[PDB]
Amino acid sequence: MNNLHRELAPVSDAAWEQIEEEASRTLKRFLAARRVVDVSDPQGPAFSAVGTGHVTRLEGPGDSVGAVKRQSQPVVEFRVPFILTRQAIDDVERGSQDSDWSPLKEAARKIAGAEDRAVFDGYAAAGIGGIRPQSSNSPLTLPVAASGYPDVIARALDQLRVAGVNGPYHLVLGENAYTLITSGNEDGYPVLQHIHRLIDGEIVWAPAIEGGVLLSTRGGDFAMDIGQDISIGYLSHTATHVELYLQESFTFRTLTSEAVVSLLPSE
């Protein structure tokens, strides 16, 4: 028994397997920051802070003794609860293949959105700066039409090159920008082929954010330290419902501020 009191839940093994498969699929579909960010192996439940290497001067203890305090970034824990109806859970053992896992999918969407917004836009309460607000390059506004995309991307690339940043360049686009770029132009311009000539991978789809980001994936610029990966735990149950939750524990740091350019949503 660990803090996820899974054995206390009135949930059969087959129902657990189906729930885990659904959660993994939905999270992999929704998680965008993990595709362009250095993700460490899970460091365990005891992992509590990451040392930044910097110090802060203190008022001295006394006679000619100087003191400095080491600085660190704390780890944050995200939890999202959801409720299953106990009819979907019991139907699995009876051979059901269309049990209602919608609350689990909504919880997965919520937690993935929270994680993505913390990594990209920042979470001030947890001490997470965010990739975009902590960029030293000048932000660029996205165009209204898709034909304007090759012009912006190129300029963004130039900034990276002028900053001395190397390595593959990856583009992350929000829902509106992604659907605008992928829906084609009515003038027959092949903007998609030109963009894929400029960028070094598939365009990443990010439902949680607005606008976009062009960033280097050489490694060592954006560190995501994982204490606990997303896992399912049990809270309580009634005669007709079961309380579960999705939980993760992580911290994020931006190490190189010149390795990312933030694209603002079009006006």
Partner: peptide, 10 residues
């Protein structure tokens, strides 16, 4: 135990 082992998707 209990994790989904999503890890890195890069």
């Amino acid at each position: 135990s209990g994790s989904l082992n999503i890890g890195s998707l890069k």
